[PDB]
Amino acid sequence: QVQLQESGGGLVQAGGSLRVSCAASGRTFTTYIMAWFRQAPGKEREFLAAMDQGRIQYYGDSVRGRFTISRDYAKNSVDLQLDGLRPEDTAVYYCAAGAGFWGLRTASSYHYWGQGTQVTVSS
Amino acid sequence: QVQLQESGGGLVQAGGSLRVSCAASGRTFTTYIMAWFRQAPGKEREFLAAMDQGRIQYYGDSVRGRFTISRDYAKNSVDLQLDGLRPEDTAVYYCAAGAGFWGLRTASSYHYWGQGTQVTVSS
Amino acid sequence: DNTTVFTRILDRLLDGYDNRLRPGLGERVTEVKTDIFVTSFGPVSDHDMEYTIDVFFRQSWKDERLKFKGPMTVLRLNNLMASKIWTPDTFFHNGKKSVAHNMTMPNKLLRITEDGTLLYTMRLTVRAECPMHLEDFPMDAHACPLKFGSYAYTRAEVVYEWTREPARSVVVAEDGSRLNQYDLLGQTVDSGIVQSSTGEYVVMTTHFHLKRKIGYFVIQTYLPCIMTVILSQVSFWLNRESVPARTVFGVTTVLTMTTLSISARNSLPKVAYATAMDWFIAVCYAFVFSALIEFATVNYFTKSQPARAAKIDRLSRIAFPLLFGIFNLVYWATYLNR
Amino acid sequence: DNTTVFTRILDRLLDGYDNRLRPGLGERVTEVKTDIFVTSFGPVSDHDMEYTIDVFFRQSWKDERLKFKGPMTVLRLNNLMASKIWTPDTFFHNGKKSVAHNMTMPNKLLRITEDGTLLYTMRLTVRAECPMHLEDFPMDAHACPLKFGSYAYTRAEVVYEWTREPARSVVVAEDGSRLNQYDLLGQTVDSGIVQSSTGEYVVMTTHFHLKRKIGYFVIQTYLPCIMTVILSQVSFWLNRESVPARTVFGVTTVLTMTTLSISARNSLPKVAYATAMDWFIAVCYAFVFSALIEFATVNYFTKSQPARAAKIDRLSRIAFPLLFGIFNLVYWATYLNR
Amino acid sequence: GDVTVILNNLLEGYDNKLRPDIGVKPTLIHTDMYVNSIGPVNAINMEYTIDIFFAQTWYDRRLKFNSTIKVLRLNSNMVGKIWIPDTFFRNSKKADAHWITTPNRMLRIWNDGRVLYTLRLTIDAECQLQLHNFPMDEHSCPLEFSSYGYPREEIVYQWKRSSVEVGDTRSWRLYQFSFVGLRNTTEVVKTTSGDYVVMSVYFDLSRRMGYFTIQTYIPCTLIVVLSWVSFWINKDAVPARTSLGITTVLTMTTLSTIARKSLPKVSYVTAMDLFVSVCFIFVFSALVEYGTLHYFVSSQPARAAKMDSYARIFFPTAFCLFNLVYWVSYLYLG
Amino acid sequence: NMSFVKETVDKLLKGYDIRLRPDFGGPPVCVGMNIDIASIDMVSEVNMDYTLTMYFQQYWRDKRLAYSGIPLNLTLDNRVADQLWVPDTYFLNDKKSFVHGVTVKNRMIRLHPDGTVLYGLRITTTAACMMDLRRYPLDEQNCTLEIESYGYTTDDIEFYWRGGDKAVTGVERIELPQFSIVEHRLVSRNVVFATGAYPRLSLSFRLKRNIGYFILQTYMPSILITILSWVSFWINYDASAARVALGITTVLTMTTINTHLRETLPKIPYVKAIDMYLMGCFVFVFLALLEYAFVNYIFFSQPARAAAIDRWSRIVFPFTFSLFNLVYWLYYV
Amino acid sequence: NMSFVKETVDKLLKGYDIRLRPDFGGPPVCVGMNIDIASIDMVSEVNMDYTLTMYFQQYWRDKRLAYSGIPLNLTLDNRVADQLWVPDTYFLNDKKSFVHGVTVKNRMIRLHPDGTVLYGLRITTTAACMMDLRRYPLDEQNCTLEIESYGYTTDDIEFYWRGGDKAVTGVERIELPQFSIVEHRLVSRNVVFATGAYPRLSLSFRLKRNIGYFILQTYMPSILITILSWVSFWINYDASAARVALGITTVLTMTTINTHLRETLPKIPYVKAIDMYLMGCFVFVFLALLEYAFVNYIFFSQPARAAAIDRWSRIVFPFTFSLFNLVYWLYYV
Ligand SMILES: *[C@@H]1O[C@H](CO)[C@@H](O[C@@H]2O[C@H](CO)[C@@H](O[C@@H]3O[C@H](CO[C@H]4O[C@H](CO[C@H]5O[C@H](CO)[C@@H](O)[C@H](O)[C@@H]5O[C@H]5O[C@H](CO)[C@@H](O)[C@H](O)[C@@H]5O)[C@@H](O)[C@H](O[C@H]5O[C@H](CO)[C@@H](O)[C@H](O)[C@@H]5O)[C@@H]4O)[C@@H](O)[C@H](O[C@H]4O[C@H](CO)[C@@H](O)[C@H](O)[C@@H]4O[C@@H]4O[C@H](CO)[C@@H](O)[C@H](O)[C@@H]4O[C@@H]4O[C@H](CO)[C@@H](O)[C@H](O)[C@@H]4O)[C@@H]3O)[C@H](O)[C@H]2NC(C)=O)[C@H](O)[C@H]1NC(C)=O
Ligand SMILES: CCCCCCCCCC
């Protein structure tokens, strides 16, 4: 059974480094594309970043240059460095994986999802 | 049945052009060699000209520069232009076809043969 | 002297020109506008996990060293001129052996406008890698990518952009499809960043979404398997005294399923997991093999318990067709949706 | 100072020399003497209708611009000098993809005598077209041609001749045969004229007369078919009460003939006529199929007309072996004489 | 501006026929390698395809320049102007650089003279495979490169701190193999014209058993089980128990040839052949069991009943015992 | 004399600008193309392409290459083509092509006194054409060859067929083993891309497949196996082993042939006309085997009606198969 | 220091004539050759050739390249070979070869103070050798490599093996899956053509084929099928369907084994040592089916003799077949 367990995250004050980590277990998702999504309460599910098997990094326009994504293919985990955090960044951060059919910026292209990690920014 | 029929020829006085034709039926001779042989009365059968699929024209020594051979591949026919005829050319002209095994200038290599056509030169 | 003016213009643009230096060196970042016109989306190879594509690859940038004044605002020059000036060193990150066509002349064009802008297109045949998960074969859909970027210049020196909106920058020709067993549902255009040991490089990406057509494998494998299972269930209607006849029914069908089982994997690369077609053959083999065992049980109980043998044969005429029909409904409903 | 003399001579020969103009341009006709040494006659391919050949292609002409007087009479020079002077543009009319070897160096020689004569040989591997009439397969013979001439100079500018008498101007090495299923009986050397859309050109032709060796197909096809026909006639000697046994004889032999019929044309090109082999498998098919209709006729008359059924089996033991023996006499005598 | 001036000064009087420090000391070259993908592994030809970014670093004091500019980042134009090491891959069969859309080469020159030269290569290397335990074999395919013409007194090679780098390990085209690990070594090889420094990268591979279970092991096992049905059929049905026996022997011959197409024509028995040969003995012995049974039917009908009963126990136990010995030997003993 | 010719050719190339087309910044240069087809071969349905060998001639006037005083058509060494301007003609549907280079590069340059340039090449190309195999093997294919200028638009270059309908020759001497060229056609038009409008010339052939090969290989074995299955009706209905073995072998053989043919064809997802016949023959041999199963199931209780079904099968099966062949061979021919 | 080396190398190439061999117009130049074999593979009977990778090296003295003052063996960049005279060595039986070119051209140039030049290349050549397959698969081939100068006769050039019989090394590290090298030999001779007499060096290998593969694939299946046919001699003659089915399958199986193997090799007219064995096993399995036919034809009228034939068949067939293998294996070994 695939489990995209997500660790890290939590409450932060006045921004700062809040590194959120996601670990894939039960299947080697190296060929697959591992992404990060953010869902503010009641707004929508928003794409943040994704790295494919060729170490190509994609970012959303609203978080470009602020959040950095990295993958540790040896340990089958993908991290996301959160820097310069803002109150608009307070949401539940999700971890996904899939083949990116019909686009890697669309949520429906990921067959596996994590349980979510809460990040709260106070300012 | 494969029948090489020959037309043209007849009586020509004191030299002059005289075209001899040959029409094929019952088999497509696009990939074969269509030649012309001349047989003087009782003497022997002599090679005159030939033409293969690549339009390469072969001629004998006795008729080089005088007789012109041409093939109409669409209508499956071969023609021979007899310019500058002489009393020495009064013989029977034959139409032949074959693969030219052991020499395209040998009468034994042509499996299909015509009936004949008399050419008479008067002077 | 009409073409002497243009000759003098060209000899002045190249007078002192240096093609080892990119435009705006130490002053700005060289921006390159890119777009692709797919003339033919070639065949997809499952054995090599790759696809072929023939494109017009157009690039454009600004080089102020090539500003000129003259009667014409554009100089549609020979592609021989393109080797005397600076051109981007674009390569395909997932590109295998590719071809730049040369018949009858180098398939390239170069055009210079009066403000120094350049247009530089070339005709290519790109073979690229497409990783494939064949766990749903022959009902699998893939997203084959096409990534390209600069090789020697980082993102602080050369950046790439699409000439138009990203959707309209990659255009596929209407009649160019060369796919035999795939459908091109659509393409997705994006742009990312790759981090290497030598720096950060902008990489432009484009994914083609392909779905496999199953018509070939229905005739090739599914129909022969379905008829083999049905053929093995005709044995139940033969009377129990035809022991030589019902043995030939069982043995021939079992060997026929063995022939199809091996033959079905010839198309696929030698993967080490069970595909969707493998599970269909395995269950079809189970129904064919179980039919032969059903006869051995009937034969064993004959001449000692004839009534029991008849009951087993009568029920088998219903259970075997019913369970195979039920299995086909579960199998096809499962794999057609996904 | 010994080597200095020859350096001065070559500088004087090439000073003011234009290699874009043939010798005697506008004054006479350039004559080229040609001869070939066939180092190996490669395999003949029937699927592609072609063959391979390796030659020492020699050419010789006269150039008054290269006359000299010095200590030597012949300058055996390097092959890079060949690109500094004018050389004929000889090509092969029916070539498909030839190779000029350049390992470890360009395999060419150039020798300049004091009177201007040049010798210019090179090593080539030519794949040439050979149309085949396969109506007598595998007892057929072919005359594969090899035609060459100038590509740009019409017969009013450049003409070709053989170095010696045409028979002795093409020499084949004794131990060069690379043929597997053929037999080079001999070659015929000729010369012709071709008219194109650009002018009249001289074509030098060589025809190699090959005869196929039937040894392979006697083992591969003719023996498995004869044994199958003989096998099906064993069924006439089994008693009429062995109905399952005599049916297996008929079915397997008919099935075997179908396998042999399909597999006989695997090597050949997809021609649209019947070869001499197809007329043997078809007749062998008729004998095998007839031997099963006879059994059905015998089995039909059993238990109702035993006298008539027994009579048919007696006659079939004589008629069937006799007719197949007569057919082989007629078949082999018809084709082995051609 | 003045970068053209700098480049003109660097190449003024520069001789690319001479290695740096041609009469002082060896040219120490540091090599990196980023493996893009290890392509298909061919057992028939005993080779494998690899695609890498190959990088070389060395010093050249003739290329020093003084300015505010630190590093000159050029392209493949200048590669043919300066001295380049003549590195080649010793075990390569067929290798080529990539040339679309331009030569895939990189050249960066620092102010102190350091030169970085990087190019992208696709190499089909030679890897001799020992197939005695096939399909349960492990291999260490090497990749050796040295200098063709410069002995150890002129060119010395050295791995950097973390030289061989991989990205997505599984994204490689390894279908039947799983990449285990990599080792990189450094030695000196003495040839007939000098001593050369050879750098090697070894890739350890383990074959995947999944394909062959679907392809060979399961079909062969089911054919053996097919012949055991003959023991529960009445002995009087002579045509029935022979067709069920003759076909399995002929079918087992068919599977034996198919399973050998993947391997090269070696002259030793692999683990696959040992399983197929044993499975052939079982189907062949079942038919001989019936022939012995059939010959004894009339003479000793009571005895013939016992011979068929034992085959229902001896044959199923013997084959289940062979699998226990076979699978333990090749998975826990080598 | 020969020193005067050398002086003339050097003067033509002195100051010549290879980077500029004739009449640069003026009226478009007209280029006339002739094609002399040498051979067509390797028409492959697997790769969906064909191979074409031809003599490709181009013909245009360049006033920079005009000379006077020499009443000759100067034929020059083919290496002089590297110093002149030639059109950037390419073939769009070309997958792989090369110019022959034995013994030298097969190329021709011939100048004329008024400045006209004749430029010929001997080209072997592998052009692409997608084939509709729905009526295979009784199908016609239209395979073309697109000729276009790459860098020059209609404002700079114009294409035409030199000689009209006679521009392309040598087609009637082509004898394909499996096809037969019915008609070739010459088309001239313009094509518009994002970079402008370019001239194009299209040469197309209409191939037609010869069926004589498939009669011996596919149709006859299927018909004979189907007829073989009808012998089962004349055999006694109480011979279980004989009629089941005859019925089973024909059914399994018919399945083998259908799969065996599809090796040398692409994995197209539709039903070729040859598949309809093999599926039609399979139904006949499958119903014959099912016919015996009904007889074997019923010949104990009702011996009389079992023999009647066998007697009718001797008429219905041969008659219905001949009706299927009548419909099949009339719809596809 | 490094400037002096540059000045010295520039001195040698000023006035150097690349078109003239060393001692042009005088005594012949001696060229010594070494070969270091890296691998031999792809020994193909289908194409009748083999592939060889080697470190080919050539050695000669040019008096124009002598230098003084530098006590070093100048190893120059391999691109300097384009400015020096090198022998025009070629391989006569070479079909397709290349010099490896990654990362640069695999080539070496090394000068010596007395003008001697060491020049090595890394070559991979597909060389042809015709095979006599009459004793296949127990044959012993002999594939050679011919070395010769294309343009220079014995008056100008002279080849020799540098080091005598130690000129070729690495022959003992070749890993051929199917063959095993027994011996290699070096030969020097002169070959006379129409153009003159040319030096030739010859390197040949004697390859012995390993028979272990063919035991598993052809000989063992053939023996087991033949033994399988003898089972019918222990089945009662009243089991007509059983004995005929056993006989028919083995006869057709032997045909299948024979035809498949001959399709892996070129269509050679003669009979190989493996065809003699399959034909021999075919006679044994064809006679067993023929032996039963006589029994089936005779057991109704006189069952006594029919049982006697089966008793003798249980001994004659196993005994004669063992006698057939004894004669066969002693003749071809
Ligand atoms: C037997 O005969 C065969 C032939 O029958 C022969 O093969 C030939 O071998 C020679 C070498 O011995 C080859 O020549 C060299 O090839 C180099 C590249 O080779 C690769 O690319 C080949 C294709 O080249 C095209 O594309 C590249 C870029 O992709 C381009 O650079 C080329 O010019 C060329 O572009 C033309 O064609 C394309 C279409 O393809 C058009 O789009 C384009 O517009 C243009 O028309 C490819 O074919 C090669 O593959 C073959 O060969 C390899 C082995 O080499 C083999 O493994 C393969 O299997 C395959 O067989 C290969 O991938 C090329 O770089 C060389 O040219 C350099 O150097 C020369 C010499 O100095 C110089 O004159 C050139 O101008 C050029 O300058 C270089 O460029 C460098 C680029 O990195 C650069 O670093 C240098 O600094 C320099 O740059 C310039 O220098 C000048 C001068 O200082 C300066 O003014 C400038 O500013 C700038 O700085 C050279 O051409 C030849 O290609 C082979 N032929 C064929 C058909 O493959 C074989 O060797 C013979 N054997 C023997 C024993 O004799
Ligand atoms: C040659 C193998 C014979 C196997 C069957 C033996 C039956 C009789 C046993 C006494």
Mutate to test the interface with C, among F13, F51, F144, F195 (most CBs of C within 10 A): F195
Which of B27, B31, B55, B56 should be substituted to probe chain D, the one whose Cβ sees the most D Cβ atoms within 10 Å?
B56
- Shared domain for C70 and C178, answered yes or no, is yes
Structure tokens at E316: 């199923």
Do residue E104 and residue C91 have CB atoms under 8 angstroms apart? yes
The owner of tokens 């294996």 is G329
The residue with tokens 């320049």 is E65
Q: Does E269 touch chain G (CB under 8 A)?
A: yes
Which residues have any ligand 2 atom within 6 Å of their CB? E 288, 291-292, 295; G 230-231, 234
Same domain, C58 and C166: yes
Ligand closest in space to the Cα of C81 = 1
| Same domain, residue pair C180 and C54 | yes
Taking the CA atoms of residue E304, residue E307, residue E312 and residue E318 in that order, the dihedral angle to the nearest 10 degrees is -160
Q: Which amino acid, residue E299?
A: S
User: Where does a domain end: D211, D239, D256?
Assistant: D211
Residue with tokens 């690990």: E181
Chain D, chain F: beta-carbon pairs less than 8 Å apart: 160
The three-state secondary structure class of C215 is helix
Count Cβ atoms within 10 A of the Cβ of residue E115 and give its class: 0-12 exposed, 13-18 middle, 19 or more buried: buried
In the chain, the amino acid numbered E101 is: T
Contact state of F102 with D124 under an 8 Å Cβ cutoff: yes
Three state DSSP letters for chain F: CHHHHHHHHHHHHCCCCCCCCCCCCCCCEEEEEEEEEEEEEEEECCCCEEEEEEEEEEEEECHHHCCCCCCCCCEECHHHHHCCCCCCEEECCEEEEEECCCECCCEEEEECCCCEEEEEEEEEEEEECCCCHHHCCCCEEEEEEEEEECCCCCCCEEEEECCHHHCEECHHHCCCCCECCCEEEEEEEEEEECCEEEEEEEEEEEEEECCHHHHHHHHHHHHHHHHHHHHHHCCCCCCHHHHHHHHHHHHHHHHHHHHHHHHHCCCCCCCCHHHHHHHHHHHHHHHHHHHHHHHHHHCCCCHHHHHHHHHHHHHHHHHHHHHHHHHHHHHCC
Ligand located closest to E288 CA: 2
Work out the angle at residue E303's Cα, subtended by the Cα atoms of residues E297 and E306, and round it to the nearest 5 degrees.
Answer: 110
- Closest to F154 measured CA to CA, from F187, F121, F188: F188
CA–CA distance, G291 with G312 (Å, rounded to integer): 11
Domain co-membership, D17 together with D128: yes
- Domain residue limits at C317: 216-337
Cα E256 to Cα E253, E323, E330, G224: the distances in Å are: 5, 18, 20, 13
Cα dihedral G252→G257→G259→G261 (10° resolution): 180
The residue to which tokens 């128990």 are assigned: E241
Phi, psi (deg, nearest 5) at residue C262: -70, -45
- All structural domains of chain G with their residue ranges: 2-210, 213-331
- CATH class of the domain comprising F212-331: mainly alpha
Q: Which element (helix H / strand E) includes D3? A: helix D2-14
Opening angle at CA D148, ends D147 and D151, nearest 5 = 135
**DSSP secondary-structure letter at C95?**
B
Whether C106 is in the pocket of ligand 1, judged by its Cβ within 6 Å, is yes
What is the CB neighbour count within 10 angstroms for residue F35?
24
Q: State the Cα–Cα distance between residues A96 and A32, nearest whole angstrom.
A: 10
Q: Which chain G positions have a beta carbon within 8 Å of E17's beta carbon? A: 9, 76-77, 79-80
Helix D278-301 / helix D306-336 crossing angle, nearest 10 deg:
170
Domain E3-207 CATH assignment equals 2.70.170.10: yes
Please enumerate in sequence order all residues whose Cβ is within 8 A of that of C101, keeping only pairs 6 or more positions apart, or say none.
C107, C123, C124, C125, F90, F94
In DSSP terms, D207 is beta-bridged to: D145, D188
| Kind plus residue range of the DSSP H or E element containing A54 | none
C-alpha dihedral sign at C278, C280, C286, C289: negative
CATH classification of the domain holding D223:
1.20.58.390
Query: C100 CB under 6 A from ligand 1?
Result: yes
Q: Which CATH fold topology does G2-210 show?
A: Acetylcholine Binding Protein; Chain: A, (2.70.170)
Task: Report residue G20: phi and psi, to 5°.
Answer: -115, 130
Ligand 2 centre to CA of C244 (Å) is: 23
Q: Distance from C276 to chain E by nearest Cα, in Å?
A: 13
Boundary (domain end) residue, out of C187, C213, C239: C213
Ligand nearest to the CA of F88: 1
Report the CATH number of the G213-331 domain: 1.20.58.390
CB D49 within 8 A of CB D18: no
Other chains touching A, judged by 3 or more CB pairs under 8 Å: C, E
Query: Which of these three, C164, C193, C213, is where a domain ends?
Result: C213
Residue nearest to atom 46 of ligand 1 (CA): C106
List residues of A whose CB lies inside 8 A of any C CB: 31, 52-59, 99-105
End-to-end CA distance of chain E: 68
Q: How far apart are CA G324 and CA G322, in angstroms?
A: 5
SS3 C121: strand
After which residues does chain A break, using C–N > 2.5 Å?
Answer: none
Task: Give SS3 for C107.
Answer: coil
The answer to whether the CB of E109 falls within 8 A of the CB of E103 is: no
Sheet holding F196-208, edge to edge: F89-91, F140-149, F196-208, F183-193
Contact present, C181 and C213 (Cβ < 8 Å) = yes
CATH number for the domain that contains residue A99: 2.60.40.10
Residues β-bridged to residue G192: G197
DSSP secondary structure letter of residue C1: -
- Asked whether residue C249 falls in the same domain as residue C127, the answer is no
How many CB atoms sit inside 10 A of residue C122's CB?
Answer: 23
D44, D171: one domain: yes
Q: Which of E198, E163, E179 is nearest to E56 (CA)?
A: E163
Select from A19, A49, A44, A28 the least CA-distant residue to A117: A19
Domain count, chain C: 2
The answer to whether E166 and E193 have CB atoms below 8 angstroms apart is: no
The CATH architecture that domain F2-208 belongs to is Distorted Sandwich (2.70)
Q: At a CB cut-off of 8 Å and minimum separation 6, what does D71 contact?
A: D5, G25
Domain containing A53: what range? 3-122
CATH topology for the E210-332 domain: Methane Monooxygenase Hydroxylase; Chain G, domain 1 (1.20.58)
Beta bridge pairs of residue C50: C45, C129
Best residue of G75, G80, G138, G220 to probe chain E, by most E CBs closer than 10 Å: G75
Q: Are residues D180 and D94 in the same domain?
A: yes
Query: Which tokens in the block code for residue C225?
Result: 């398997």
Q: How far apart are CA F151 and CA C120, in angstroms?
A: 10
F89 is in an annotated binding site: yes
Alpha-carbon distances, residue F315 vs F231, F318, F322 (angstroms): 12, 6, 11
Angle formed at CA C225 by CA C221 and CA C228, multiple of 5 degrees: 145
